[PDB]
């Protein structure tokens, strides 16, 4: 599924990301935008055999178990397939664990390169929440 900008913002607000661990909602919509372009089925195989899954491109090397990545750690104790659902529950639950680490949202490369330092709140403006 491909969420609309406002559709995702409202959904993420429902999943409690409006101000999770110091990150305003705009951050999460922006990140999803440049990470997967709002596509929940998006996947990307990396140079280390790990794969990024979901609307938030969660990596199989540290976060989820896809069963085919070398030193998989599965910190989110969840199978990567759960992060490919049209239902964002798993992706959010896992992303909250990721951001609870000291690296914060820097865990997301696209977010760091396209959102950190920009007017992220712009991503929720003009939306019925």
């Amino acid at each position: 599924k491909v969420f609309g900008r406002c559709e995702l913002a409202a959904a993420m607000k429902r999943h409690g990301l409006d101000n999770y661990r110091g990150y305003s909602l705009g951050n999460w919509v922006c990140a999803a935008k440049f990470e997967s372009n709002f596509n929940t089925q998006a996947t990307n195989r990396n140079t280390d055999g790990s794969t990024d899954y979901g609307i938030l491109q969660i990596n199989s090397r540290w976060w989820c178990n896809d069963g085919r990545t070398p030193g998989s750690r599965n910190l989110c104790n969840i199978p990567c397939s759960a992060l490919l659902s049209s239902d964002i529950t798993a992706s959010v639950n896992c992303a909250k664990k990721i951001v609870s680490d000291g690296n914060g949202m820097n865990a997301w490369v696209a977010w760091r390169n396209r959102c950190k330092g920009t007017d992220v709140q712009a991503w929720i403006r003009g939306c019925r929440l």
Partner: antibody
Amino acid sequence: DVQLQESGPSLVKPSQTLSLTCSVTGDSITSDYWSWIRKFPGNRLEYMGYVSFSGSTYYNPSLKSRISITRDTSKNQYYLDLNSVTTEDTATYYCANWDGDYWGQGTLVTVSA
Amino acid sequence: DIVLTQSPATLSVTPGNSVSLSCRASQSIGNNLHWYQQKSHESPRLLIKYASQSISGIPSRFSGSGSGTDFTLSINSVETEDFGMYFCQQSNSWPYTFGGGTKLEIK
């Protein structure tokens, strides 16, 4: 599967450093976030802090920076150090994973002269 | 620090009856409110996570609801195994905090 267990002294003296060890079995310490939670005599719970996979830590301001949480990979166990304790630190200590599904048995530590 | 308040502090019920336990936060925390149960001489057990998500291994009679600052934990048809303490905890902001707890005992 995963199991946690706290070990350490039950009785400590005021002003000394209270230390507890949490033994993890069933998986590597390096594969999760680990925490410490204590229960005060009045049925009051306080989240002390946790250490994430990158080694970064988060401590409860209430502890006024007397706390330290470290990991020992080889021994597959993590610890809690609490400096200059007072009778106010008397409580039942628990170690648990960040997710909250795995908890130790909890261990009472009494601070007394 | 976010402050979680649980009321009532004590609740007496007859097995077979249903109860609802309240937990309010001093400010909004979205869905970042979790429920724990704790029996004497025992460690806390996660019942509900993120306001309403179920936990594998926990009886189905337990359910949570709420968002923002108002939350409730529900026990459809209380059982003897359910008497003990119930605590809510927020993870929206650091430091994580617990509510004062509600005690559930036989009427």
